[PDB]
């Protein structure tokens, strides 16, 4: 809810800090797309692929989209500060990145977590995928049920 300084300082973005679902309206499952972000304006800087890439490999398996294309798509819609930071380098990508990918590639994911299945991504979509998540630690995403 509070405004993150790296986000407001991020020169790849413009405008005010708003929930993802306000800046990118879709039929998201409630309380999944409320995370704060800013509109991405600068073209891609071609960030290196994340070292902890299991979310990309899992979504890639289920969509047949390369991890490179998934990652470049994330750079179309999210500020760089939300893609390369202390958290992504030590914990990997998160279900918030999954929500962003779900918008960019029009799918809804069922995430089979240690707490049960949870939907991420817009309902106004045709494509469905299955992703497994274990808390660990470490966090791990895998494709399929």
């Amino acid at each position: 809810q509070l405004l993150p300084a790296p986000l407001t300082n991020d020169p790849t973005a413009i405008g005010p800090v708003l929930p993802f679902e306000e800046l990118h309206p879709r039929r998201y499952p409630e309380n999944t797309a409320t995370f704060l972000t800013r509109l991405r304006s600068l073209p891609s800087n071609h960030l290196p692929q994340p070292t902890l890439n299991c979310l990309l490999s899992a979504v890639s398996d289920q969509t047949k989209v390369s991890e490179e294309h998934l990652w470049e798509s994330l750079q179309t819609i999210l500020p760089d500060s939300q893609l390369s930071n202390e958290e992504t380098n030590t914990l990997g990508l998160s279900t918030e990145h999954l929500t962003a990918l779900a918008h960019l590639y029009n799918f809804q994911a069922t995430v089979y977590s240690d707490r049960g299945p949870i939907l991420f991504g817009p309902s106004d979509t045709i494509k469905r995928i299955d992703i497994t998540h274990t808390t660990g630690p470490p966090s791990h995403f895998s494709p399929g049920k």
Side-chain angles (χ1 to χ4, degrees), residues 24-124:
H24 312 294
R26 300 296 293 274
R27 299 293 171 105
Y28 304 100
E30 216 175 34
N31 287 334
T32 59
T34 63
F35 59 93
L36 300 182
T37 189
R38 291 172 76 209
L39 179 62
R40 173 68 186 247
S41 178
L42 254 204
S44 178
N45 289 307
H46 310 294
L47 300 179
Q49 304 283 133
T51 299
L52 299 165
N53 64 311
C54 60
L55 181 67
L56 301 184
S57 53
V59 175
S60 175
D61 173 269
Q62 288 281 298
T63 60
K64 305 306 175 191
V65 181
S66 63
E67 305 187 27
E68 295 70 20
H69 289 149
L70 297 170
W71 185 241
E72 284 286 357
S73 302
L74 279 169
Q75 294 169 77
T76 264
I77 205 179
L78 286 181
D80 276 354
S81 53
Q82 296 191 312
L83 296 173
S84 180
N85 58 51
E86 175 154 338
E87 167 173 323
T88 59
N89 262 256
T90 57
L91 305 170
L93 305 183
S94 66
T95 54
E96 299 166 351
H97 298 99
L98 175 64
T99 289
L101 286 175
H103 162 75
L104 291 154
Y105 282 94
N106 295 325
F107 61 82
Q108 194 173 71
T110 306
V111 176
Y112 293 88
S113 78
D114 301 340
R115 190 166 268 291
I118 306 165
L119 306 179
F120 292 93
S123 297
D124 52 306

